[model samples]
Target: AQSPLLKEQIETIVTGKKATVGVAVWGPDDLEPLLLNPFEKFPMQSVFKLHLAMLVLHQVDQGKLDLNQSVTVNRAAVTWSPMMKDHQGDEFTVAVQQLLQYSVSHSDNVACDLLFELVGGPQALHAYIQSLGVKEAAVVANEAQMHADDQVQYQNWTSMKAAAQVLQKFEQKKQLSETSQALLWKWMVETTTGPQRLKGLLPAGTIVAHKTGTSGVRAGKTAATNDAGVIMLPDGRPLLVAVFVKDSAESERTNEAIIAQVAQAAYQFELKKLSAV
Candidate 1:
C-alpha cells in the first residue's frame, strides 16, 4: 500500500523548516518503515543518556550492579548540572535508582554524569551498544565534558534510525530484565523535557515513552533538537518514531514545530491504518 498523503505531508514539513532533519517512523508489525536521511549522524546531546541508562540496567540484569547501590552526591558532581541548582550541600547519599530517575525524567546533568562515571565512562557505553550490533552511534563524553568544551558535542552522535532502534529494543525488552525494563520505561514516560516537541501535538493523555535532546546555540546555529520514542496508538499497538533537527538557524519554536509535525504525521498515518482494518 503506497502512502502518498503521508509522504507528501512529511515532505512539506521537512522542506519548510530552516533545519536539517532526519526522521524514521515504524508502525505495528513492521508495516515497512519511513525514513529521511535516517543514516546521517547528528548530535545525541542528552539523548545518549538513554543508551547509558540501558547499559547500566543491562549490567544490573547481569548481576554486575544493583539498582539500590548507593553513591554520594558531592558538590563537584552537582555543579555540573543545570537541574541540581536547588540541591545545595557538601554531599548527600543517593541510590542508583534515584540517579536513573533524575537523569531520564529530569534530564539532570549531575545525575547523568554520576551514572556515566559509575558505569565506567562513555567507552563502556559504546562497547555495550556495539555489542548489540548497532553502529549508528558514537558516544564519547558525559555532560561535564561536553559542557566544558563545545568540540566534545560533535563526538556524541546517533542517527535517527539508531535512536528509533534503541526505543524498539527497549520496547521488546531486549537484554534487560523485566524489572529493569519496567523501571526505565516508567522514567521515560515521566520525562518532562521538550514538552513542546514530539508529544507536543499529540492528544492529551496519550502515552509516548520518549527522550529529548537539545543543544545550546553556537555560532548562530542550534546543533541539535531531537525527540525519539515509542508512541502508543489508540488501538494498543506501538508506533516508533525518531525526529532529529540539526544545525538549525530557526527559532526554538520553529525547530520544535518540525518535530511536532513529523510526529503527528506518523501518528495520524498509523491511526488511519487502524481505522481501515
Candidate 2:
C-alpha cells in the first residue's frame, strides 16, 4: 500500500509545475513498489557515470583491465569538469582507481570520457547495459559531445524504472567480483554530488550510497536533475530510490526540495513497516 502522506506530498510538490518528475522506490521484495512517471525517459546527464563505472568494474572482474593501470591526461581531453577546472598538469598519468574515484565522487566529466574510451566508448557501455537486460536505457554521447549540443542530452536517457533496475542489479552483488563490488560501493558512499537531493532530508550520519546527475539550464529550463541510490534503513532494509526531475522551470531549490521530500516520505514509511514487524 502507498503511504497517503507520500502520495500527497509528492502531488503537492509537482502540482502546477513545468517539471517532469520520475520516481521509483523499491523494498527487498517488491521490485516495482512505487512509481511516478516511471516509464518516461529523462536525460541521464551525469547519472550515466554509474553505468560507465559498472562497465569498468566488469572488465576488471574479467581480468581484461586493472584498476592499478595508468592512463594519461592532457589539457584538451579534459572537458568541462568541476574538479578539473583549475587543473595544472600538462601531461599527467593516473590510475584506473583514481579515474573511478574522480568520475564517481566528483562527477568529473574528463575522467568519465577517459573511462568511456577505456571500455570502448558509449556504445560499448550501452551494449553492456542492454546485455544485462535493461531495455529502457541508452548511453550514446560523451561529455564533450553532450556539452556542445543541447540535443545530445536527449540521446542519453533512461526511464525511472530502468535506472532503478540498474541500481538493483548492482545491489544484488552477483555481477561483480567481491573486490570490484566493494570498490564501486565505496565510491558511491563517498559521492559528493546531490547530497541535498536523495539524502537531503534524512537524519545525520545515514548511509546513502547514490549517484546524481545535473544538466545545463538553457533558456530558463533545466533538462535534468536526478538522484538515485540505496538508502540503508534504520531497520537494516535497503530502500532503493530514483528521482528524476526533467525540463524543470522551477528554481534549483524547488527541484531539489521535491526529491528530498519524496525520499523522506518513502524512508519514513519503510521505517514504520520495519517497526511493525
Candidate 3:
C-alpha cells in the first residue's frame, strides 16, 4: 500500500504531526506528481508570497507599477506586533523590488504588509491572480491563513496541479510579458526557498528558482506549508514544481530538509524520464 522506504522516511518526519507533502517535475508536455498522500491539501504559507511577487511584477511590466518606484514607510504601514517591531515607526523607504525581496527572503511580516498595501491590498492581488486565469480559490487572503501562532492556512488554497501551472505559465511567458517573466524568474532565484526538497537534489549553483513554505503549530494549531518554482535543472531541462507540507509534527526545520530530499528525488526521477527519449 506504500512505497515502503519512502513511506517510512516521510512518516518519520511527520511523526506526532499532521502533514502532507507533494512534488512535481514537469516539462512542456508532461508532469510527474510525487506525494505521500496525493489527495490531501496543505496551505501554502509563505510560498504564496511568491505569487504575490509575480503579480506585482506583472503590473510593473504593464507600466501600472514600477519596480524602481520608492515607497515611503511609516509606523502603521510597517508595524506587526512582536514579530515585526523593528519596522514600526521607521521611515525607511524601499522600492517595490526591495520590499518584494524582503517579503520573500526574510519572510518579513512588515514587508509583506507594505507590499500588500501598495499593490492595493488583498483585493488587488486577488484581482491580479484572476487576470492570470487562476481561480478564486487560488487567490491569497491578506496575511495568509493562520489557525494559531505558527500554524498557518493558506486561504489562497491551491492544489499542487494549480501551483505547478503558475510556474509553467511564467516559464512560457503566457501569463505576462517576457521581460516580466524573466524578472520574476530572476527574483525567485534570489529569494530563498527553504533548503528542503529541490535544494537538496541539484548540483551547487544549479538554478532552481522557486519558493517554499513550512507549516507548524506554535501553540497547538494546524500549520499549512508549501514551496513552488521553476527549476533550471543541472543539465538544463526546465521544470516547474510546487511542494506543500501541512501541520508537520516534526521541527519545521527537519520537515524542510525532508521536503528537499523529495524535491531532489523528483527532479532526478524526471531527468531520467526525459533522457530516455
Candidate 4:
C-alpha cells in the first residue's frame, strides 16, 4: 500500500549519513522490487560467502562434494570475520558442513577460501553466477585477496538488484536439491555476523536468513559493510532485502545502523500490507 512511504523512510535514514547506501527489496505480490541508489556497484566483502555456499551446496546436490568430507588444517592460520581473520599452522580438521558453517554463518575467511578452492576458484563461481542470468554481480576475488589488496574488493561487487535476484533464484528456482537448500538455509538463518544490520530492528524471533560483508575502515573511509537476506514475513512469504554501504566517511557502527534502519522500514512496509488484507 505505502511502498512510497517505505522508500521515503529509507531515503531519510541514508540521506542523514555520509555514504552512498543502496537498498533493494522484494516484497509480496509486487511485480518489481523497491530500490534506492540501485545502480551503484557496491563491494560485497564476505557477502559473497552466501553465493559461495550456494555453489558448494549445488556440488553436494550433484554428488561431487560431500558435506561430511573433512580436511585437516592449521588452526593457527585462521582469524576474524566476526567471521574474519589471518592464519599459520595449528592443525585441526573440519568437515565440509563445518566449513560451510564457519564460512556462511560465521563469515570465516579461511573457510571461505577453502570452499572457493573446492568449487574451482573465483572464475568458476563467477561463471556459475553468469549462467543464472545475472550480470551486475561479480565474484572474482576470494577473501584472502581482498584483504591483501584493498583495490581487489571492487572487483567483487554487486548491485542491490542483482543480489535480490540471487536471493530469489536461490530460494525459488529449485536449482539446489531440497536437502542442500535446507542445509544452506539453516546456515544463513543461524548466521552470527552483523547482527546490528538486517535483523537489528526487527521484532524478536523474526526469521531472517542472510549473510554479511564487512571490510574494516581504511584510513577515514569504510568501503563496504553490507547485509542481504530473505526474510520470512508473518504471512509466510519471503521478503528479499539487500543493503550495501559504500565509500562511507562514517564509522562502521553508523553504517550498520543504516542497514538496520532500511530493513526495519521494509518490515513495516510488509506488515502494513498484511494489515490491509
3 versus 4: better TM-score goes to:
4
Clash totals, every prediction? 0, 0, 7, 10
lDDT of 1 by residue, 176-260 (tens): 8889999999999988788878798999888988888888889889999988888999988888888989888999899998998
TM-scores for all predictions: 0.94, 0.94, 0.78, 0.93
- Model 3, 1-277: lDDT tens per residue? 1234444554554455455555444553454433445555556666777778777777787798887898887654432333344444456667887777777665665677677877788668767766777562354456632423332354556666656666766677777777666666776787655655567656677787877655545655336556677777656767676666665565666666666766665566556656776
Winner on lDDT between 1 and 3 is 1
Candidates in order: C-alpha RMSD to true structure? 1.7, 1.8, 4.6, 2.4
Best by lDDT: 2
The residue-by-residue lDDT of candidate 2 on 14-56, one tens digit each, is 6777799988878765746577887688999998998999999
Worst 10 residues of 4 by lDDT: 81-90
Which residue pairs in candidate 1 have backbone atoms (N, alpha carbon, C) closer than 3 angstroms, thus clashing? none
Regions more than 4 Å wrong, model 1: 77-83
User: How far off is residue 133 in model 2, in Å?
Assistant: 0.6
Lowest lDDT block of 10, candidate 3:
144-153
TM-score, candidate number 2: 0.94
Judged by whole-model lDDT over C-alpha atoms, candidate 4 comes out at 0.85
